[PDB]
Short mmCIF file of N, CA, C and O in Angstrom, two decimals:
data_model
loop_
_atom_site.label_atom_id
_atom_site.label_comp_id
_atom_site.label_asym_id
_atom_site.label_seq_id
_atom_site.Cartn_x
_atom_site.Cartn_y
_atom_site.Cartn_z
N UNK A 2 0.95 -1.20 -0.01
CA UNK A 2 0.03 -0.11 0.08
C UNK A 2 0.85 1.10 -0.03
O UNK A 2 2.20 1.07 0.07
N UNK A 3 0.30 2.22 -0.27
CA UNK A 3 0.97 3.65 -0.32
C UNK A 3 0.35 4.60 0.70
O UNK A 3 -0.74 4.32 1.17
N UNK A 4 1.15 5.65 1.06
CA UNK A 4 0.47 6.63 1.89
C UNK A 4 0.60 8.10 1.10
O UNK A 4 1.46 8.35 0.45
N UNK A 5 -0.56 8.88 1.46
CA UNK A 5 -0.33 10.20 0.86
C UNK A 5 0.68 11.04 1.62
O UNK A 5 0.73 11.17 2.88
N UNK A 6 1.36 11.77 0.96
CA UNK A 6 2.35 12.75 1.35
C UNK A 6 1.93 14.12 1.38
O UNK A 6 2.49 14.97 2.31
N UNK A 7 0.82 14.47 0.78
CA UNK A 7 0.14 15.83 0.73
C UNK A 7 -1.20 15.48 0.57
O UNK A 7 -1.70 14.43 0.31
N UNK A 8 -2.02 16.48 0.82
CA UNK A 8 -3.57 16.40 0.47
C UNK A 8 -3.67 16.62 -0.97
O UNK A 8 -2.78 17.45 -1.49
N UNK A 9 -4.74 16.18 -1.51
CA UNK A 9 -4.97 16.39 -2.84
C UNK A 9 -6.48 16.63 -3.16
O UNK A 9 -7.22 15.69 -2.65
N UNK A 10 -6.84 17.78 -3.55
CA UNK A 10 -8.34 18.07 -3.98
C UNK A 10 -8.54 17.85 -5.38
O UNK A 10 -7.98 18.30 -6.22
N UNK A 11 -9.60 16.87 -5.60
CA UNK A 11 -9.91 16.54 -7.02
C UNK A 11 -10.12 17.76 -7.87
O UNK A 11 -10.80 18.80 -7.62
N UNK A 12 -9.64 17.48 -9.17
CA UNK A 12 -9.74 18.47 -10.35
C UNK A 12 -10.54 18.06 -11.44
O UNK A 12 -10.85 18.95 -12.33
N UNK A 13 -10.93 16.89 -11.33
CA UNK A 13 -12.13 16.36 -12.27
C UNK A 13 -12.90 15.33 -11.32
O UNK A 13 -12.48 14.91 -10.33
N UNK A 14 -14.09 15.09 -11.92
CA UNK A 14 -14.87 14.34 -11.19
C UNK A 14 -14.44 13.01 -10.81
O UNK A 14 -14.81 12.47 -9.67
N UNK A 15 -13.85 12.32 -11.63
CA UNK A 15 -13.15 10.98 -11.36
C UNK A 15 -11.81 10.76 -10.69
O UNK A 15 -11.33 9.81 -10.57
N UNK A 16 -11.33 12.16 -10.30
CA UNK A 16 -10.19 12.06 -9.48
C UNK A 16 -10.70 11.51 -8.04
O UNK A 16 -11.81 11.43 -7.70
N UNK A 17 -9.57 10.99 -7.34
CA UNK A 17 -9.87 10.82 -5.83
C UNK A 17 -9.13 11.98 -4.95
O UNK A 17 -8.06 12.23 -5.06
N UNK A 18 -10.05 12.60 -4.12
CA UNK A 18 -9.49 13.56 -3.05
C UNK A 18 -8.98 12.58 -1.93
O UNK A 18 -9.45 11.60 -1.66
N UNK A 19 -7.90 13.19 -1.38
CA UNK A 19 -7.32 12.40 -0.16
C UNK A 19 -6.65 13.44 0.59
O UNK A 19 -6.33 14.54 0.28
N UNK A 20 -6.33 12.83 1.86
CA UNK A 20 -5.64 13.61 2.95
C UNK A 20 -4.11 13.07 3.03
O UNK A 20 -3.99 11.76 3.00
N UNK A 21 -3.13 13.99 3.42
CA UNK A 21 -1.88 13.42 3.82
C UNK A 21 -2.16 12.20 5.01
O UNK A 21 -2.87 12.59 5.99
N UNK A 22 -1.39 11.13 4.86
CA UNK A 22 -1.39 10.18 5.83
C UNK A 22 -2.43 9.12 5.46
O UNK A 22 -2.49 8.07 6.22
N UNK A 23 -3.22 9.35 4.47
CA UNK A 23 -4.37 8.34 4.07
C UNK A 23 -3.54 7.08 3.51
O UNK A 23 -2.64 7.36 2.73
N UNK A 24 -4.09 6.01 3.71
CA UNK A 24 -3.45 4.89 3.00
C UNK A 24 -4.20 4.57 1.82
O UNK A 24 -5.52 4.27 1.92
N UNK A 25 -3.61 4.13 0.69
CA UNK A 25 -4.20 4.03 -0.55
C UNK A 25 -3.71 2.63 -1.20
O UNK A 25 -2.39 2.28 -1.13
N UNK A 26 -4.53 1.93 -1.95
CA UNK A 26 -4.26 0.73 -2.73
C UNK A 26 -4.16 1.27 -4.16
O UNK A 26 -5.14 1.95 -4.77
N UNK A 27 -3.05 0.95 -4.77
CA UNK A 27 -2.91 1.39 -6.18
C UNK A 27 -3.41 0.24 -7.03
O UNK A 27 -2.94 -0.68 -7.02
N UNK A 28 -4.48 0.56 -7.80
CA UNK A 28 -5.28 -0.32 -8.58
C UNK A 28 -4.71 -0.38 -10.04
O UNK A 28 -4.82 -1.44 -10.66
N UNK A 29 -4.50 0.76 -10.52
CA UNK A 29 -3.88 0.75 -11.97
C UNK A 29 -2.76 1.77 -11.92
O UNK A 29 -3.04 3.04 -11.62
N UNK A 30 -1.48 1.35 -12.40
CA UNK A 30 -0.42 2.27 -12.59
C UNK A 30 0.31 2.18 -13.87
O UNK A 30 1.53 2.59 -13.94
N UNK A 31 -0.42 1.79 -14.99
CA UNK A 31 0.12 1.61 -16.15
C UNK A 31 -0.17 2.77 -17.34
O UNK A 31 0.25 2.58 -18.42
N UNK A 32 -1.12 3.53 -17.01
CA UNK A 32 -1.59 4.59 -17.95
C UNK A 32 -0.98 5.86 -17.90
O UNK A 32 -1.22 6.63 -18.91
N UNK A 33 0.17 6.21 -16.98
CA UNK A 33 0.89 7.39 -16.94
C UNK A 33 1.09 7.82 -15.57
O UNK A 33 1.17 6.99 -14.62
N UNK A 34 1.36 9.13 -15.33
CA UNK A 34 1.62 9.76 -14.29
C UNK A 34 0.34 9.67 -13.21
O UNK A 34 0.61 9.86 -12.02
N UNK A 35 -0.87 9.69 -13.78
CA UNK A 35 -2.00 9.46 -12.85
C UNK A 35 -2.36 7.95 -12.70
O UNK A 35 -2.43 7.28 -13.74
N UNK A 36 -2.47 7.71 -11.46
CA UNK A 36 -2.78 6.34 -11.07
C UNK A 36 -4.09 6.13 -10.56
O UNK A 36 -4.71 6.97 -10.00
N UNK A 37 -4.85 5.02 -10.85
CA UNK A 37 -6.13 4.76 -10.30
C UNK A 37 -5.91 4.15 -8.76
O UNK A 37 -5.01 3.16 -8.89
N UNK A 38 -6.33 4.83 -7.89
CA UNK A 38 -6.24 4.44 -6.48
C UNK A 38 -7.61 4.18 -5.80
O UNK A 38 -8.53 4.88 -6.13
N UNK A 39 -7.53 3.23 -4.80
CA UNK A 39 -8.70 3.12 -3.93
C UNK A 39 -8.17 3.38 -2.46
O UNK A 39 -7.20 2.74 -1.94
N UNK A 40 -8.97 4.32 -1.78
CA UNK A 40 -8.50 4.67 -0.50
C UNK A 40 -8.95 3.65 0.44
O UNK A 40 -10.24 3.19 0.49
N UNK A 41 -8.18 3.14 1.17
CA UNK A 41 -8.52 2.13 2.41
C UNK A 41 -8.97 2.87 3.42
O UNK A 41 -9.70 2.05 4.42
N UNK A 42 -8.99 4.09 3.57
CA UNK A 42 -9.40 4.86 4.71
C UNK A 42 -10.82 5.36 4.50
O UNK A 42 -11.58 5.37 5.41
N UNK A 43 -11.06 5.91 3.16
CA UNK A 43 -12.50 6.21 3.08
C UNK A 43 -13.36 5.36 2.06
O UNK A 43 -14.58 5.66 2.05
N UNK A 44 -12.75 4.41 1.36
CA UNK A 44 -13.34 3.50 0.44
C UNK A 44 -13.63 4.12 -0.86
O UNK A 44 -14.23 3.41 -1.81
N UNK A 45 -13.24 5.44 -1.24
CA UNK A 45 -13.50 5.94 -2.52
C UNK A 45 -12.37 5.50 -3.51
O UNK A 45 -11.34 5.21 -3.04
N UNK A 46 -12.58 5.63 -4.79
CA UNK A 46 -11.61 5.30 -5.90
C UNK A 46 -11.66 6.22 -6.92
O UNK A 46 -12.73 6.81 -7.36
N UNK A 47 -10.47 6.67 -7.47
CA UNK A 47 -10.48 7.63 -8.54
C UNK A 47 -8.84 7.71 -8.66
O UNK A 47 -8.10 7.20 -8.09
N UNK A 48 -8.65 8.62 -9.82
CA UNK A 48 -7.44 8.86 -10.18
C UNK A 48 -6.67 9.98 -9.33
O UNK A 48 -7.17 10.91 -8.77
N UNK A 49 -5.36 9.68 -9.22
CA UNK A 49 -4.46 10.48 -8.21
C UNK A 49 -3.08 10.76 -8.96
O UNK A 49 -2.59 10.01 -9.84
N UNK A 50 -2.45 11.86 -8.57
CA UNK A 50 -1.07 12.14 -9.12
C UNK A 50 -0.12 11.36 -8.34
O UNK A 50 0.06 11.27 -7.09
N UNK A 51 0.76 10.57 -9.13
CA UNK A 51 1.51 9.50 -8.55
C UNK A 51 2.63 10.29 -7.67
O UNK A 51 3.14 9.57 -6.75
N UNK A 52 3.07 11.40 -8.03
CA UNK A 52 3.97 12.13 -7.08
C UNK A 52 3.53 12.67 -5.78
O UNK A 52 4.35 13.32 -5.18
N UNK A 53 2.34 12.44 -5.41
CA UNK A 53 1.83 12.87 -4.14
C UNK A 53 1.77 11.84 -3.07
O UNK A 53 1.31 12.01 -2.05
N UNK A 54 2.18 10.48 -3.53
CA UNK A 54 2.00 9.37 -2.54
C UNK A 54 3.37 8.60 -2.56
O UNK A 54 4.16 9.05 -3.64
N UNK A 55 3.71 7.87 -1.68
CA UNK A 55 4.93 7.09 -1.57
C UNK A 55 4.51 5.65 -1.06
O UNK A 55 3.53 5.49 -0.26
N UNK A 56 5.23 4.62 -1.29
CA UNK A 56 5.18 3.29 -0.78
C UNK A 56 5.18 3.41 0.67
O UNK A 56 6.05 3.90 1.45
N UNK A 57 4.29 2.55 1.38
CA UNK A 57 4.05 2.28 2.74
C UNK A 57 4.49 0.90 3.18
O UNK A 57 5.06 0.43 2.36
N UNK A 58 4.02 0.52 4.40
CA UNK A 58 4.44 -0.57 4.84
C UNK A 58 3.52 -1.71 4.50
O UNK A 58 2.66 -1.58 3.61
N UNK B 13 3.51 22.30 -2.62
CA UNK B 13 3.32 20.91 -3.00
C UNK B 13 3.82 20.68 -4.36
O UNK B 13 4.13 21.72 -5.17
N UNK B 14 4.02 19.59 -4.87
CA UNK B 14 4.65 19.11 -6.13
C UNK B 14 3.86 19.75 -7.17
O UNK B 14 2.66 19.71 -7.25
N UNK B 15 4.53 20.06 -8.50
CA UNK B 15 3.66 20.44 -9.63
C UNK B 15 2.86 19.06 -10.18
O UNK B 15 3.44 17.91 -10.17
N UNK B 16 1.62 19.37 -10.43
CA UNK B 16 0.82 18.17 -10.80
C UNK B 16 1.23 17.74 -12.27
O UNK B 16 1.69 18.61 -13.21
N UNK B 17 1.38 16.48 -12.49
CA UNK B 17 1.76 15.99 -13.98
C UNK B 17 0.81 16.24 -14.86
O UNK B 17 -0.65 16.26 -14.61
N UNK B 18 1.00 16.33 -16.21
CA UNK B 18 -0.02 16.54 -17.24
C UNK B 18 -1.01 15.17 -17.08
O UNK B 18 -0.47 14.17 -16.69
N UNK B 19 -2.18 15.27 -17.58
CA UNK B 19 -3.00 14.16 -17.68
C UNK B 19 -2.47 13.07 -18.47
O UNK B 19 -1.89 13.25 -19.60
N UNK B 20 -2.68 11.77 -18.11
CA UNK B 20 -2.56 10.78 -19.00
C UNK B 20 -3.02 10.70 -20.40
O UNK B 20 -4.02 11.36 -20.55
N UNK B 21 -2.30 10.11 -21.25
CA UNK B 21 -2.92 9.91 -22.59
C UNK B 21 -4.31 9.26 -22.62
O UNK B 21 -4.45 8.20 -22.01
N UNK B 22 -5.27 9.90 -22.97
CA UNK B 22 -6.55 9.22 -23.00
C UNK B 22 -6.49 8.16 -24.06
O UNK B 22 -5.91 8.19 -25.03
N UNK B 23 -7.38 7.05 -23.72
CA UNK B 23 -7.62 5.89 -24.59
C UNK B 23 -8.80 6.02 -25.53
O UNK B 23 -9.75 6.62 -25.09
N UNK B 24 -8.55 5.58 -26.67
CA UNK B 24 -9.62 5.56 -27.76
C UNK B 24 -10.36 4.34 -27.88
O UNK B 24 -11.49 4.25 -28.34
#
């Protein structure tokens, strides 16, 4: 899993908004810099900027 | 915060 290093507010409807410290499951990471992620903290799913998160434990 | 990357290539 990954952790958010910054907050991120969605900029299109299918983005995922998240908070620093949130734990994320990366669901698709083959389409470019934006990854499809599922928040294990909120249960929501959407696209995220890959440079805002880092591998966690 | 980091610069946001350009959006991915849209798929057709």
